[PDB]
Amino acid sequence: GPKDYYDILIIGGGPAGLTAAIYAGRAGLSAAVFEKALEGGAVTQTHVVENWPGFIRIEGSELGEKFAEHAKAFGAEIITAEVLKISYDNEYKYVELDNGKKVKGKVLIYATGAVPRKLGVPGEEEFRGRGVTYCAACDGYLFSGKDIVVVGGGDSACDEAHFLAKMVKSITMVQNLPYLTAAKVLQDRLLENKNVKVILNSLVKEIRGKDKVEEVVVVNNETGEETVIKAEGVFIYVGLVPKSDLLKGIVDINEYGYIKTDENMETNVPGIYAVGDVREKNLRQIVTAAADGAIAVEHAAKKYF
């Protein structure tokens, strides 16, 4: 049940948006968080979070809820709804929800995240959090001393494989094309890592295990031959998808779908900011999303009110 007006409209209820909500409430500003799925965002889809300072080891779903409760403690209203359209006039911003309701605000914080592309193979969903992950920074440590697979051969896959090789026993990369697509510099760093092996022109067919991941079945695109790779973890890096379509044609977006902003997180449209993983940036973590949300609201609190 949203009201007609809020000082700040926040699209997305992941760490970026929820931090923005916390900062908005503690700036004396009314705020609405529109979240189509689960409050907490991607955190709710991770097993344990070990890199949110202050919590040594906490379940992602629990942390996400802590974030949502914190935002509500200070006044923000979390609304379960999908935002379908965004528009703006001289000084107000508007959103239309999937329930027909239209909401007005002075400022809009866009925090829709960026979703990892999936493999779409058996075992991928089943083992999420039990060997299957899409974030090396987040979970790599958990795989120290283990054999793992990294799927993909682009910038992210090669960059994160290099990162992981310092901790994991071995990496088998599975790349679909007959070559790696990552920048040479990124590929060059991988050659330092003798505990890394690359399998080209192949796809993951299935991910198998009992309680946790135990094997990955790979199939060659040319021959169809199948190989069984023993592994305890699968890090998937076959692409990321920023959820910026609501702002396509409204704000400057880069070639890959990520929203451009200045140092205050502001887009080229006054009063519209982009925070967290949907923004053009290098490191997508809970702490960098939180920092973006803080920066944006602090700046807006002073500039537009």
Ligand X SMILES: Cc1cc2nc3c(=O)[nH]c(=O)nc-3n(C[C@H](O)[C@H](O)[C@H](O)COP(=O)(O)OP(=O)(O)OC[C@H]3O[C@@H](n4cnc5c(N)ncnc54)[C@H](O)[C@@H]3O)c2cc1C
Ligand Y SMILES: NC(=O)c1ccc[n+]([C@@H]2O[C@H](COP(=O)([O-])OP(=O)(O)OC[C@H]3O[C@@H](n4cnc5c(N)ncnc54)[C@H](O)[C@@H]3O)[C@@H](O)[C@H]2O)c1
User: Residues 6 or more apart from 137 whose CB is under 8 A from it?
Assistant: 51, 160, 163, 283, 285
Residue 75, annotated as binding a ligand = no
Would you say 27 or 219 has its CB closer to ligand Y?
A: 219
Q: How far is CA 5 from CA 71, 77, 120, 276, 279, in A?
A: 18, 12, 41, 24, 26
Tell me: is residue 153 an annotated ligand-binding position. yes
Total of residues contacting a second copy (CB under 8 A): 50
- Comparison of 7 and 35: residue with beta carbon closer to ligand X: 35
Instruction: Specify whether the CB–CB gap between 149 and 173 falls below 8 A.
Output: yes
Cβ contact 86:250 at 8 Å: yes
**Which of ligand Y, ligand X, a second copy, none has residue 151 at its interface (CB below 5 to 8 Å by kind)?**
ligand Y
Tokens 């702490």: give the residue: 287
CB of 121 to a second copy, least distance (A): 28
Of residues 84, 87, 118, 141, which one binds a second copy by CB under 8 A? 141
* Phi, psi for 189 (deg, rounded to 5): -65, -30
Q: Which of 10, 22, 108, 240 binds a second copy (CB under 8 A)?
A: 22
Binding site for ligand Y (CB under 6 A): 119, 151-157, 174-177, 181, 203, 237-240
Is 260 a binding residue for a second copy by CB under 8 A? The answer is no
- The HSE-up count of residue 94 (CA atoms within 13 Å, CB side) is 10
Distance CA 70, CA 22 (A): 7
What gap in Å lies between CA 174 and CA 142, rounded to an integer?
21
Residue 220 among known ligand-binding residues: no
Q: Which does 295 bind (CB under 5 to 8 A by kind): ligand Y, a second copy, ligand X, none?
A: a second copy
Place of tokens 């006039």: 89
Query: Any idea of the CA torsion for 288, 44, 20, 118, to the nearest 10 degrees?
Result: 60
Work out what residue 51 binds among a second copy, ligand Y, ligand X, none; the CB cut-off runs from 5 to 8 Å by kind: a second copy
For the beta carbon of residue 21, count every other beta carbon within 10 angstroms: 31
Least separation in angstroms between CB 205 and a second copy: 30
305 binds, among ligand X, ligand Y, a second copy, none (CB under 5 to 8 A by kind): a second copy
Residues found near ligand X in the complex (CB under 6 A)? 11-17, 34-37, 41-43, 82-83, 111-113, 135, 138, 243, 246, 276-277, 284-286, 289
Among ligand Y, ligand X, a second copy, none, residue 82 binds (CB under 5-8 Å by kind): ligand X
Name the binding residues for NAD(+): 153, 156, 175-176, 181
